[PDB]
Each structure stands twice: as structure tokens, then as C-alpha cells.
């Protein structure tokens, strides 16, 4: 028992961190076969940041003017490409630590682990969402740009993120590996504000499930309601819609614990309408929603 | 910016991961060097759960009786020791992933990663702390047992935790590496209820340092205290008492900050009258104190 922010073990991606250099910019690159993938924002100097042109940036370079370091042994680059805002290196040598690895591009509330790094070393593990709003609140210093988010199944990683830049606002954007921003953010140093950052609702009932699986049940309530009428409470609380997907995603839980999906609803309505008046659910003063309906299943089943 | 709950990378510790399996019961073992440790409860039967002799049953098992598989390939057992609640089981290869390691025992407050196994099989990783009352709040299931918390400097793995049992509550007790339980824990399956779970005062402080770093200001008041006056409001909400060595150890957040420790204890004393009014710290609608200030200093400043 006990439920906890969970990252995946994050060994299979240490393998894969390397060090990118070009010019005076020192950021991280995710290693994969012969190929080195990082942000194309690794060209750029103090005078580049503001109105970036990346293709006639990157006319100036070649080969031999991207530094990567694998540990403290340099690879040799032996070809270079833009792809949307990464850059791919290839190196002529593959990774012997090479994972079995996938490339996907994830939707919002979906979750994923962060490996945070500097200078192509890892620092910390930590669990995020792809926040409604297409941001991630995650922790990254400068220097932390092409860290890489990722998921897990069984043996095979699935790299969904690739970190590239704060906003003024402390929120973090990114892209898939490859090179396309989560949002509507662009890699340049202008006013990018985030839309409103709603709840994911069918995380917050994972999460209310996974916290009755845990014994923690006070928030239960004697009623039930429709899906319009939760929507219309969701809609004043800057709460996602739930739809019937999220309904049907929320089955294996609803089935393990005996509580419909729509009577865990009404209890999660209660407690936006009424508040925790003091209490904690799961050590939590507030409504988690960092966690998916498959990361409660894993977490309570022991997937490894 | 931002600030997570972070976890160290586990990948020097997912190399050490085994599988340990005596008669029916298997659970996790750590493999550094030669010798796997794991919990000594993995002799134990349905009938030995309530009042075991662990010296008696032990007499019965031989070096043979011990599986150990590291991956899909099995150990060979060439001797056995049982120290304290640990069993220590030579095997004939050392571990080639052994890192540079050492065996510390942590005092309460302190906080450290664990990487959750099953079968040998890591299933994830996160970040604890050893409460003040030897509890750690984990997340583990059946099976989980001989899974390790640990702390890396460097490249220096740090192990002071073995998962052994969860008490009736619901929270978690263990071991150092030594088999020494951290409180009045005893490996049986018998009536051992937790003392009063309190806040760790000097976390608290180092996570409201961590804030105020982040832009988080609002809590920030016009006052200042004692740590008198400070320790009287901290014992009548279960904070542990704040000593001068714990202002001394906040020392580096005051200096970056510019807030004397004081004056942040005078903040933390209005949060704790008043409450936090529906307002949130760093995403959270309670007062943190699984950070240490090493933690806090260490993930605001990117070490590697
Ligand atoms: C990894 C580089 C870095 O530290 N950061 C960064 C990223 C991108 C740029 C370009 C060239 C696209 C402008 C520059 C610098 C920052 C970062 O994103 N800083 C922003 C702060 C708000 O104004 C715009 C620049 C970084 C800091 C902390 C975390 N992640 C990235
Ligand atoms: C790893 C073994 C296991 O799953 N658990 C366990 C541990 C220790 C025992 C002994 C032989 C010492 C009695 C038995 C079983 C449990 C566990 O600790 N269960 C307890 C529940 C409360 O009553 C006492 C037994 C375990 C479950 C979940 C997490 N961690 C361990």
C-alpha cells in the first residue's frame, strides 16, 4: 500500500545522455544508435536568442563545430541535420547502450518521467504531465535544455519530450523528438504566454480511485450524476470535460474498487463545490492530477 | 525554476537488483560485489510470519535452498550469513555494474530515493523521507521487500534503506544495510503501532526557501521571532523542535535568499496559525517537508 509521484527507472536513458557543445552553448543530447538528437537552439549566441533565422545560423556550421562528449569520451560527428527544432548529429559510432526506443508524441494529461541533466549528466528523476495548456511544470535550471521525458513498457522506451525552453512564467516547453513544440511555442526569446492551465479530470478520478484502493475514503458521498451535469461543475472550475473515453478509460478502476465511474464524480463534484475543509487525500491538501488511469493500475498492480 | 519532488537517477542501483527466492516466498535482493543482501524474512513460511526464530529456521536452509537470479541468469550461492535482520549471501561472481558504494544509516528527517522492485524487476522510482517516527511513507506492494533506499554523491551510491514490512497502517518499515531496523520495528508479524508522525520543521523551512527562490513570495510576512517563541507554536502543531544546527544547516538559503532564518520561521509560524487560506506553495496546498536543505540547495543549483 501507499501511493507515490512515481518516475520510471530512469537507468535505460542515463545510458543515452551526452554533452553537446557548439560555439560558447553547452546543452544535453539524447543518444540513440549513430544518431545524437538535441535542440537546434544549441547554434544560437546572446545576439541569436531574440529573432533566430536556424537555417542561415546553421549555413555557419559544420561537422566538426558540434562537440559531443559521451562520459568523458569525445564522438566524432560525422554528419548534421535540422529536423523542425532539433538538430540530429550522426556519430560514427552507435551507442552500445542503445535501449529499445520508440518516438511518440503524447497528448495532454498524459504523463511522463523527466530526466533532468547538465553537461550530459543526469541530476534528478522526476514525474510530469502534459499540462492541458501544452506546458509542462517541470525543474530545470539553465544548461538542463535537452533533457528528455519519456515512458516505459517493459523493455522498451518511449521518448515523448525533449526539454527547450522556460517562459517568463516559470513553465517549461518543449518538443517531441521530432522537433515539434508541444503548443504553439517557437524556440526564440519573445512574449509566449501560456492559455489557462485546467485540470485533467480523468487523472483526478484515477487518482481518487487509487486513493480509495489506498484506504483514504472520507470524500466518498452518497450521490451519483451525469456526465453533463459533472461538466457543467468541471466547466465553472477550470476542469477538462470528461467524455465517455475518459469513462471507459476509468473501467478497470471502477470494476477493482465497485464504484461506478459517474458516483466517483458526484464525490469528486462535492469536493469542488464543498473544498477539503482541512483534510488530505492521499498526504495531498489538493486534487492531484499528475496521474493517469494506467499509472494508478501500474503502480497498484507492480507492473515492472 | 521550478521545484520537484526529485529522485536521484537510479541506474547505478537498477545494476544491483536481484531476485532472491527460499521455498515460496521471493522477494528483491542487492547484489555489490559478491554478497546479495536481502531481507532475512525471505525464510519465513505462512507459519512463521506471526513468531519466527529466525536463528531456528535458518539451521534448516542451505547455500542450495537460496535462488538468485540477476536477470535471467542464476547466482551460485557459496555461503550464507544472517546479520541482524539482513541475509547476506555470498555468491561466486561479484556484480560487474557494482558501483562505488557505502553503507550509511540516515537520522529521521532526512530524506533519500527508492527504487521500488518486484521480482528483481524495477518498477520505479521516488523520493522519501525517514519520518521523525522511523516510518518512511512509501509505496510497496506485496513482493517489494529487499528494495532499497539510497542517497548518490557523485558517483558514490549512498544505500540506507532495505524495504521489510508494512504495518497495519499502512506505512513502511526497514532496515539499514547493517539489518538494523530504523526504530522499534521487529521482522513479525505482530501489534507494532507508529508514534506521532511529526512535521519536520528544518525541511519545511528549506522547501519555503526553495519557494521564495521560485517567485513563490506571498507567504512572506513583516515579522520575525525566536526560536523560543518559534519552538512553542512548532510543538503545539507536532513540528519537531528547531535547533541551532538546523539554522546553522539553513545558512546557505539564507544567504542566497537574503531572509534571516528567523524572520522565515516568523513566516512559517503565521502559516501554521492562519493557514494557507486557499492559497498554494510551489503546487502545494500543505507545508513540505520531504526536502532537506541539501536537497534544496543541490536541485536549485543543477548538481550533477
Ligand atoms: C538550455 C538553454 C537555457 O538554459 N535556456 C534557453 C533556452 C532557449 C533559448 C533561446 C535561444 C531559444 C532564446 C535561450 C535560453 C533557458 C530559457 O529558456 N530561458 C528563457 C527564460 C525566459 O525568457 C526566454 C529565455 C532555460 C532556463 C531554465 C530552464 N530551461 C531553460
Ligand atoms: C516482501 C514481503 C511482503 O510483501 N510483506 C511481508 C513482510 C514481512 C513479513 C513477515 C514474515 C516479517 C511477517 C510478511 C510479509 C508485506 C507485509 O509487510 N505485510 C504486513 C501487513 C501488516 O501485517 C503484517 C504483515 C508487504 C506488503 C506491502 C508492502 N511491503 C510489504
Given at each position: ?100 526506443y520508440k518516438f511518440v508524441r ?53 521518448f515523448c519530450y525533449m526539454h ?141
Amino acid at each position: 500500500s501507499g501511493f507515490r509521484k512515481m518516475a520510471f527507472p530512469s537507468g535505460k536513458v542515463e545510458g543515452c545522455m551526452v554533452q553537446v557543445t557548439c560555439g560558447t552553448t553547452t546543452l544535453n543530447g539524447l543518444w540513440l544508435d549513430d544518431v545524437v538528437y538535441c535542440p537546434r537552439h544549441v547554434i544560437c549566441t546572446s545576439e541569436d536568442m531574440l529573432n533566430p533565422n536556424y537555417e542561415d545560423l546553421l549555413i555557419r556550421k559544420s561537422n566538426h563545430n558540434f562537440l559531443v562528449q559521451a562520459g568523458n569520451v569525445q564522438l566524432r560527428v560525422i554528419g548534421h541535420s535540422m529536423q523542425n527544432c532539433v538538430l540530429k548529429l550522426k556519430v560514427d559510432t552507435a551507442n552500445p547502450k542503445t535501449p529499445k526506443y520508440k518516438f511518440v508524441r503524447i497528448q495532454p494529461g498524459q504523463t511522463f518521467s523527466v530526466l533532468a541533466c547538465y553537461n550530459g549528466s543526469p541530476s534528478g528523476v522526476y514525474q510530469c504531465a502534459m499540462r492541458p495548456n501544452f506546458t509542462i511544470k517541470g525543474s530545470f535550471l539553465n544548461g538542463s535544455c535537452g533533457s528528455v521525458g519519456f515512458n516505459i513498457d517493459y523493455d522498451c522506451v518511449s521518448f515523448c519530450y525533449m526539454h527547450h525552453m522556460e517562459l517568463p512564467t516559470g513553465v517549461h516547453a518543449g518538443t517531441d523528438l521530432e522537433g515539434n513544440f508541444y503548443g504553439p511555442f517557437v524556440d526564440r526569446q519573445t512574449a509566449q504566454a501560456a492559455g489557462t492551465d485546467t485540470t485533467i479530470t480523468v487523472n483526478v478520478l484515477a487518482w481518487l480511485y487509487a486513493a480509495v484502493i489506498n484506504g483514504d475514503r472520507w470524500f466518498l458521498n452518497r450521490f451519483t450524476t451525469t456526465l453533463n451535469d459533472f461538466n457543467l461543475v468541471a466547466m465553472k472550475y477550470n476542469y477538462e470535460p470528461l467524455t465517455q473515453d475518459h469513462v471507459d478509460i476509468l473501467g478497470p478502476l471502477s470494476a477493482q474498487t465497485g464504484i461506478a465511474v459517474l458516483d466517483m464524480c458526484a464525490s469528486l463534484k462535492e469536493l469542488l463545490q464543498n473544498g477539503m475543509n482541512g483534510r488530505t487525500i492521499l498526504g495531498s491538501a489538493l486534487l492531484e492530477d499528475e496521474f493517469t488511469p494506467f499509472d494508478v493500475v501500474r503502480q497498484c498492480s507492480g507492473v515492472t
